[PDB]
């Protein structure tokens, strides 16, 4: 169905331990394709997915340029924000950048994104119009004004609506076999008695792609929120994902409970029952 | 304020060191260093995003090095300097990267790497009074300036009337000619003409000065020749208005 | 990396000049700079996808995303338009890569041309006097001395403004005893309207 390209940048200052660490990660939906680490020996944008390795020297040259540039801007930006928020040199601080684009099954532009966070909390965000910013405080307002003078939003719009979608459409073509496959979950059920009167029913979904799944517990038609426990979608480590959902049931009432599994790769929504 | 660059000109000897300074537009995050050999297109050397390097691939790491330690001003060093390094070292600045941003270049540092410092000569400036055949035939009068036997081409010719610089009715040669055209180390010659009304030249209380600013050697350069050290200096030639 | 064409151009004042810049790969931004006698490149226009069609004073420029080319249009050229124009190129970070360059020469239109050679008086300390050939038409080209002991400068243009008078001129001198006017400039394409005093 729908596809997306996301870029996650992290900058952490380290007082009296040297200059800050920059980490860059690129994704095409749920698959990582690029990596950059300011502490790595290479000091280059490195491939992580097989289908990106085919890109020439010019590609890795530009990608290294852009990340080195952001890396360098953040080193200054950490002290600048430390200034705005009135914080001492002793204390570790984080700057996180999230940006990218969304396209549909037709491969047509849907949305552009640009968000910034200081110490894990919202700092400055580019609105859906890609024409204006949203400052979260008086400090972020100083940046807004600076980025207003710099004509940042206009420049951000040019990339997010243009090159971002061009690159994403290109990645979908080159990595067709892995990026465009819909692997359905291999579903099964387990029973674990916790008492003589109480029992635990667990519903598993394994080896599925994309990570977007739904595991709902039902009892004689109605939904179950009370006594329903879910783990967050975890990576298998081989490009697939895993997830389970459990519910504590009274012994003998196992046939009253059903589990509905929903996935993009699954033709019809699966219903599992003990 | 504009992009500042020190020095304007520099004469160095083949195998000696050289340093170029650059101060970008206050606030500008990006700083560039370009090398322009002769009249050709400037070739990128290094790019700086704040305190650090974005691209140094174009830098000959053997001789060239550049720093921007506090992310404001930058310095480019050559150690040792080769004859090939005789070029204008342009410095550019931009607010950041950049697609809407155009570069702001500084005046640059004109470098001349020489085989020998004894080859450096200051100019000999002589001014020439208009012809009487000119004032009679043509309605106007033209004064010719001539700076001779200087090396290298590090001169700035300017005309001065009554303590004020003149740009109207002024024309200086775009390129200077060699006195000994065969030799590449040959001393140069350059002319500039100032044209005014025949009446202006007739008036005696009018001053006509020809200023040539030569960019030579420093106090720190070792000089062993019989002639005086050809240091950075102004050499003038002047003539007063005549009714004769 | 960008292909700047033509490498050089010479045209009369008021003529149109069209200088273009091409790219092998897809464009990001096209920069345009002007450069004079040992001067700093002065920024003219910047073109990208936003637009495309820009202008600086009386010069206009184009950006053709599909053709991967950009052109600079110099209509009705003025003497101030000389000399070197540079096409610079995009990069995702805007890192500029300059083209070869274009040396532009704008020759003036002289209304009343009367070629004449004059001998200028020495101010005080000089062996021999200087010769000046002036008020000649921009078509006539000055030739360098085939004899190495005589120095002849290339043609240069003056702008008087307080008269709207523009004139071409060439300077010649020699330390040689066997040197005089009329025979000094006679090597170049000399016209019939020339004045030689005696």
């Amino acid at each position: 169905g729908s596809h997306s390209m996301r870029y996650f940048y992290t900058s952490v200052s380290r007082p009296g331990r040297g200059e800050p660490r920059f980490i860059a990660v690129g994704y095409v939906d749920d698959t990582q394709f690029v990596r950059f680490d300011s502490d790595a020996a290479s000091q280059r944008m490195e491939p992580r997915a097989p289908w990106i390795e085919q890109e020439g020297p010019e590609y890795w040259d530009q990608e290294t340029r852009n990340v080195k540039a952001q890396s360098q801007t953040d080193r200054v930006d950490l002290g600048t924000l430390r200034g705005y928020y009135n914080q001492s040199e002793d204390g570790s601080h984080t700057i996180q950048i999230m940006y990218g684009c969304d396209v549909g099954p037709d491969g047509r532009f849907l949305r552009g994104y640009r968000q910034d966070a200081y110490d894990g909390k919202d700092y400055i965000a580019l609105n859906e119009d890609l024409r204006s910013w949203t400052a979260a405080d008086m400090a972020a307002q100083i940046t807004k004004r600076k980025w207003e003078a710099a004509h940042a939003a206009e420049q951000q719009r040019a990339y997010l609506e243009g090159r971002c979608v061009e690159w994403l459409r290109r990645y979908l073509e080159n990595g067709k076999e892995t990026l465009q496959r819909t692997d359905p979950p291999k579903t099964h059920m387990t029973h674990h008695p916790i008492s003589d009167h109480e029992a635990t029913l667990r519903c598993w979904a394994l080896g599925f792609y994309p990570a977007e799944i739904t595991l709902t517990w039902q009892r004689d038609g109605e939904d179950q929120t009370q006594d329903t426990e879910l783990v967050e979608t975890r990576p298998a480590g081989d490009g697939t994902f895993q997830k389970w959902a459990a519910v504590v049931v009274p012994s003998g009432e196992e046939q009253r409970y059903t589990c509905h599994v929903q996935h993009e790769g699954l033709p019809k929504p699966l219903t599992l029952r003990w | 304020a504009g992009v500042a660059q020190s020095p304007r000109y520099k004469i160095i000897e083949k195998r000696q060191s050289v340093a170029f300074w650059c101060n970008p537009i206050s606030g500008h995050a990006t700083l560039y260093w370009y090398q322009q050999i002769l009249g050709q297109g400037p070739k990128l050397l290094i790019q700086f995003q704040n305190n650090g390097v974005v691209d140094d691939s174009q830098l000959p790491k053997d001789r060239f090095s550049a720093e921007r330690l506090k992310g404001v001003d930058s310095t480019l060093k050559i150690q040792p300097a080769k004859l090939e390094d005789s070029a204008v070292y342009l410095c550019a600045s931009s607010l950041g990267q950049g697609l809407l941003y155009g570069y702001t270049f500084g005046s640059g540092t004109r470098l001349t790497v020489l085989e020998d410092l004894n080859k450096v000569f200051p100019p000999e400036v002589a001014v020439f009074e208009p012809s009487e055949a000119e004032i009679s035939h043509t309605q106007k009068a033209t004064l010719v300036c001539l700076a001779t036997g200087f090396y290298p081409d590090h001169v700035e010719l300017s005309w001065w009337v009554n303590g004020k610089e003149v740009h109207s009715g002024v024309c200086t040669d775009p390129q200077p000619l060699k006195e000994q055209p065969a030799l590449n180390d040959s001393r140069y010659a350059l002319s500039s003409r100032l044209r005014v009304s025949a009446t202006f030249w007739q008036n005696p209380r009018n001053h006509f000065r020809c200023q040539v600013q030569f960019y030579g050697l420093s106090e720190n350069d070792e000089w062993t020749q019989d002639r005086a050290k050809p240091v950075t200096q102004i050499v003038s030639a002047e003539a007063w208005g005549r009714a004769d | 990396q960008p292909v700047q064409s033509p490498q050089a151009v010479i045209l009369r004042e008021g003529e149109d000049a069209i200088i273009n810049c091409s790219s092998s790969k897809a464009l990001y931004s096209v920069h345009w700079y002007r450069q004079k006698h040992g001067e700093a490149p002065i920024f003219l226009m910047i073109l990208l996808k936003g637009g495309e069609q820009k202008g600086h004073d009386k010069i206009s420029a184009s950006f053709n995303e599909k053709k991967q080319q950009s052109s600079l249009y110099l209509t009705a050229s003025q003497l101030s338009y000389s000399g070197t124009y540079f096409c610079g190129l995009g990069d995702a970070g805007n890192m500029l890569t300059f083209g070869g360059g274009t040396r532009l020469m704008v020759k003036p239109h002289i209304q009343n041309p009367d070629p004449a050679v004059y001998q200028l008086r020495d101010s005080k300390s000089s062996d021999k006097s200087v010769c000046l050939f002036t008020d000649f038409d921009s078509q006539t080209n000055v030739s360098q001395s085939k004899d190495s002991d005589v120095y002849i400068t290339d043609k240069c243009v003056l702008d008087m403004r307080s008269m709207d008078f523009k004139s071409n001129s060439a300077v010649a001198w020699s330390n040689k005893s066997d040197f005089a006017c009329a025979n000094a400039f006679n090597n170049s394409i000399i016209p019939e309207d020339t004045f030689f005093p005696s």
């Binding site: 870029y7 860059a24 690129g26 690029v34 944008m45 590609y59 530009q62 990608e63 340029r65 852009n66 990340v67 540039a69 952001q70 801007t73 200054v76 930006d77 600048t80 924000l81 940006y99 910034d116 400055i124 940046t143 600076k146 980025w147 710099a150 004509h151 940042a152 420049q155 951000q156 040019a158 990339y159 090159r163 971002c164 061009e166 690159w167 | 995050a29 995003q49 704040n50 607010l95 950041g96 990267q97 950049g98 697609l99 809407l100 | 990001y28 990069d91 995702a92 970070g93 805007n94």
Partner: peptide
């Protein structure tokens, strides 16, 4: 492909 424009100080 990463963004290279705009990369300005905040």
């Amino acid at each position: 492909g990463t963004s290279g424009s705009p990369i300005v100080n905040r």
